[PDB]
Write a protein that binds this ligand. Sequence first.
Ligand SMILES: Nc1ncnc2c1ncn2[C@@H]1O[C@H](COP(=O)(O)OP(=O)(O)NP(=O)(O)O)[C@@H](O)[C@H]1O
Ligand SMILES: Nc1ncnc2c1ncn2[C@@H]1O[C@H](COP(=O)(O)OP(=O)(O)NP(=O)(O)O)[C@@H](O)[C@H]1O
Ligand SMILES: [Cl-]
Lengths: 295, 295
Amino acid sequence: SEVLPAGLATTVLVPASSANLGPGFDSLGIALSLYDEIEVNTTESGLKVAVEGQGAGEVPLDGSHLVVRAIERGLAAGGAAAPGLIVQCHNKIPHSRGLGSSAAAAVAGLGVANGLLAKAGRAVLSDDVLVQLASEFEGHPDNAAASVLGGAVVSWSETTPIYAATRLDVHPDIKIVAAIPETRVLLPQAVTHVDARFNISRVALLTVALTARPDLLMTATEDRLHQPQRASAMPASADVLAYLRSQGVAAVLSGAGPAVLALTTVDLPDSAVKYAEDQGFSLVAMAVSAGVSVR
Amino acid sequence: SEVLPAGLATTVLVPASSANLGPGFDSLGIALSLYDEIEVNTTESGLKVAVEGQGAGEVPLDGSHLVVRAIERGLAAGGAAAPGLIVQCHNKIPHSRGLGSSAAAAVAGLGVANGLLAKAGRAVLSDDVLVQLASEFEGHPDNAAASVLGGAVVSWSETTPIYAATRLDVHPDIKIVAAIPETRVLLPQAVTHVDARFNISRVALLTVALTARPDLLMTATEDRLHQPQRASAMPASADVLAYLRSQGVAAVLSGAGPAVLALTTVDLPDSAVKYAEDQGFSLVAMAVSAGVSVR
Ligand SMILES: Nc1ncnc2c1ncn2[C@@H]1O[C@H](COP(=O)(O)OP(=O)(O)NP(=O)(O)O)[C@@H](O)[C@H]1O
Ligand SMILES: Nc1ncnc2c1ncn2[C@@H]1O[C@H](COP(=O)(O)OP(=O)(O)NP(=O)(O)O)[C@@H](O)[C@H]1O
Ligand SMILES: [Cl-]
């Protein structure tokens, strides 16, 4: 496979994302305006990884770094190989918080591949290929499709599993606030038909509430297939979630938590802001973001 | 409650509907341009019921008739009562075929009440109340909401159960063909979490496919929670369903069957039309309908 020239550079901006959004377990995701920025240069030989910000000192500084793995996977998919790499990460996406830092790193590395391929005069990978490859790193497509495509996404799989997604236009009156604090619960293998039908009606309603009917966000963010089962092992997230919802705020777990996402139609009460902080949660307002950007 | 004057008349036209539409079990429905016509007059006393067409000779002609039940429930909800009634039905919605004749009957009777209330100068029942009351007759809101609201609907329940729905704007390139023939199974009590996540991703996708991306109808109409389990008890429906999908036609069970619905953007293959007929099914082309009409 054609070895890339040395001396190419590209910079990538990848957003955080929040999966599930209540009942949309393993399918729904939404891209948020909190970014990691990755700058990469091709060189004659070797690999240097530098990391500043979130996860600094917690991520590997070698070829096992998720971004580097994704760079190499994307290049291979594009029929190329890097002669050598310098990789600099400026991270603002918190790790292990439910905001999709692993998915963003894979999407970023694949974005870097598209940047390097283009500047070498080669074909880039289509968004569908980006979604496929990023989801393979995660094992499920919801965060990955969100970081690739932006907006809100409906993702799905076909079973070598195929991963795909489509982008929704989030209603402009919906504003997202993330409550971010400072092992995974085993989910039931089987669920009642009644509970499955419940989530079916709610996730179907959720795509409508995200796009056309923001007044239905409370009803559409109800869930019976993962949030109640996770509550006892993460009481403070469950407590903040319960409090926001009791105040009419459409609150959901950000993925598996512990962060909590509020899909708001009016600004949060000062009381709710104070309640979250008392539990240890910082409230960060975020806009729905576009997908990964490459230049 | 105010007794209505004798001598009022109203005519109601109610569409059939198709529930589930694949993975949207107990939530999704779509209104079809196949109508029952109900003419009602208030009289000094008594109850006279005449029925023509579908269901003629099999439905009760007394106060237990579903339309009459719905008229009186609606009038009572409207704070009124009929001194006497003449009810004549011209039915084209086949019964016991998966095309929502029971829900259509309740919606028609409730529409009749709104017609009589209006001509008596009283407030009519809101669409939300119509959906609530019709769904109470059915035990589920998907057929009822479709017949009330028209178009495609996402319906849901909250727990006296609350039944509600919201109307989707079906993509104009989507045209419906019903395979209508001339059997009972108890669905499984539990389903795997895996199968629930599957239907979750597909029903979320279906709302997008019905409204913006009809090219996704095949993927979005896949189901694991009721259609495969109903195949054995309705072999000919399952065969027509399986064959249409094998030919690239987004086919689903109409409700619980035995009718089969094709969600098409182009007319059916010359061959598939013949395969359905060979299996005993008449293929009827239908447009998405508006809701119940009252005059
Ligand atoms: N930006 C990153 N760069 C490199 N490796 C990363 C990065 N983010 C995550 N990882 C790897 O994944 C680990 C954290 O994984 P994880 O707990 O899934 O966090 P997350 O994906 O950001 N949040 P969550 O939604 O809770 O899964 C790190 O210790 C790394 O091994
Ligand atoms: N238009 C109608 N007028 C009066 N009674 C009706 C009408 N439609 C259905 N019924 C009653 O409902 C019975 C048949 O119910 P059924 O056929 O199971 O309902 P359905 O709504 O057509 N079911 P499905 O379309 O298969 O989901 C009849 O024997 C009547 O008692
Ligand atoms: Cl906790």
